[PDB]
Structure 1
Amino acid sequence: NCTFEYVSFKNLREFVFKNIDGYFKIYSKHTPIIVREPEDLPQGFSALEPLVDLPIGINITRFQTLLALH
């Protein structure tokens, strides 16, 4: 079901996925950090504004990420 379709090192992306009562809530924040060592998360405070609310109603216990390769 393709129900929802939307078209809108130097970059850190933070997301929170939260599945409550059949609602998938995605909070997001993008920040342009400059850090020499990417071995650790940077020290600081970033507030995550809410982005996406989906009434999918599915049951989730596992997840995986997608990569772009050539």
Structure 2
Amino acid sequence: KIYSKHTPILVREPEDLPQGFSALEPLVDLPIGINITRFQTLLA
């Protein structure tokens, strides 16, 4: 289960987190079976 909430066109300085309601939605489900305890986030 992958819960992504990507807000574009948000006109604000970075500072800290803004005020609002976030409803995480499972975009895609992928049933492997293995469990993960460590990982690294890739960046371009």
Asked if structure 1 preserves the Cα contact closer than 8 Å seen for 2:2 and 2:25, the reply is no
RMSD of aligned alpha carbons: 1.7
Alignment length, in residue pairs?
A: 44
Q: Deviations over 1:5-34 (max 9, x none)?
A: xxxxxxxxxxxxxxxxxxxx1122221253
Report the identity percentage: 98
TM-score, normalising length from structure 2? 0.66
- Mapped to 1, the partners of 2:35 and 2:43 lie a distance apart of 24
- Mapped to 2, the partners of 1:58 and 1:51 lie a distance apart of 20
Unaligned runs of 5+ in 1: 1-24
Report what 2:34 is aligned to. 58
Relative contact order, higher structure (CA 8 A, sep 6+): 2
The answer to which structure has the higher strand fraction is 1
- Mapped to 2, the partners of 1:51 and 1:34 lie a distance apart of 21
Unaligned runs of 5+ in 2: none
